């Protein structure tokens, strides 16, 4: 009865693919321009 061994490896490889996908999409966050309003040289105008 190997119904819980293959399910175990399936859960492991689904978590591995989830970690690989989340690692690919957190690597697409570094390419975005930072939204930091750099205060002493970029004082944001009040309304």
Partner 1 sequence: VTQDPMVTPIREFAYLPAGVMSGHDLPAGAQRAGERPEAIANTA
Partner 2 sequence: PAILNPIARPEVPQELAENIILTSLNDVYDWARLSSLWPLMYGTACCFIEFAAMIGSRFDFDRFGLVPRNSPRQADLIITSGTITMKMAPALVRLYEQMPSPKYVIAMGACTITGGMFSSDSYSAVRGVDKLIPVDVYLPGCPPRPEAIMDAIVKLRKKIANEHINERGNLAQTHRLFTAKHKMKPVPPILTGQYLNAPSRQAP
Partner 3 sequence: MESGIDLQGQFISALQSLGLSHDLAKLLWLPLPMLMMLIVATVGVLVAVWLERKISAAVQQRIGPEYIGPLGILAPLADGLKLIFKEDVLPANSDRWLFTLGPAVVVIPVFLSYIIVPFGQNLLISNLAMGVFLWIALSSIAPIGLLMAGYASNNKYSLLGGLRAAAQSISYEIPLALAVLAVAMMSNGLGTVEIVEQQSQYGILSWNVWRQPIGFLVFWIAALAECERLPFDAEEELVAGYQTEYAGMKFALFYLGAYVNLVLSALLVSVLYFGGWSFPIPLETIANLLGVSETNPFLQIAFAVLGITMTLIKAYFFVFLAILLRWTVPRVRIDQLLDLGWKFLLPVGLVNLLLTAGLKLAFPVAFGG
Ligand X SMILES: CCCCCCCCCCCCCCCC(=O)OC[C@H](COP(=O)(O)OC[C@@H](O)CO)OC(=O)CCCCCCCCCCCCCCC
Handedness of CA 19, 21, 17, 15 (dihedral sign): positive
Distance in Å, CB of 7 to ligand X, minimum: 8
> 1-47: which residues touch partner 1 (CB under 8 A)?
33, 35, 37, 40-47
Q: Is 8 helix (H, G, I), strand (E, B) or coil?
A: helix
Binding interface with partner 2 (CB under 8 A): 34-40, 43-44, 46
Q: If you search the block for the tokens 């859960």, which residue do you land on?
A: 11
Q: Does residue 19 touch ligand X according to CB under 6 A? A: yes
Question: Nearest 5°: phi and psi at 9?
Answer: -70, -30
Contacts with partner 1 by CB under 8 A lie at: 33, 35, 37, 40-47
């Amino acid at each position: 009865f190997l119904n819980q061994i293959t399910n175990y490896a399936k859960e492991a490889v689904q978590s591995a693919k989830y970690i690989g996908q989340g690692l690919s999409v957190t690597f697409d966050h570094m390419r975005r321009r930072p939204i930091t309003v750099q205060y002493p040289y970029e004082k944001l105008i009040p309304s």
